[model samples]
Target: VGINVDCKHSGQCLKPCKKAGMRFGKCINGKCDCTPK
Candidate 1:
């Protein structure tokens, strides 16, 4: 299983998620990834 956030860095996506009841996920290289369960 997998998910995509369309981001290139957790540092770039963290703020928006933090404001929307979400949090920054793992960043591989330059992509922000949401870990699958």
Candidate 2:
């Protein structure tokens, strides 16, 4: 589920998880969705 992701270090803060070959929808509160979809 949402337990295998690693959000460590500086890269994790600015880069989206999907860009690093990770799954979509990391932010559960639907915050990023407000951007250009």
Candidate 3:
């Protein structure tokens, strides 16, 4: 589990996660979940 962010695709999370300084990101439950390394 991680921070919930808006994303368009499973691969779309990368941009938001990168801006948030997270290493991992995926579209979960219709949103982007970004996790730290």
The top-ranked prediction according to TM-score is: 3
lDDT tens per residue, model 1, 1-24: 112455666666565445444555
Q: Which candidate is the best by lDDT?
A: 3
TM-score of each: 0.36, 0.22, 0.61
* lDDT of candidate 3 over 1-37, digit per residue (tens): 5456766677988877777778878988877787777
Pairs with backbone N, CA or C atoms under 3 Å apart (clashes), candidate 3: none
Superior candidate under TM-score, 1 versus 3 = 3
True lDDT of residue 23, candidate 1? 54
Clashing pairs in 1: 8-30
lDDT of 2: 0.36
**How many clashing residue pairs appear in each of the predictions shown?**
1, 0, 0
> Pairing residues by index, what is the TM-score of model 1?
0.36
Q: Which ten contiguous residues of candidate 1 have the minimum total lDDT?
A: 28-37
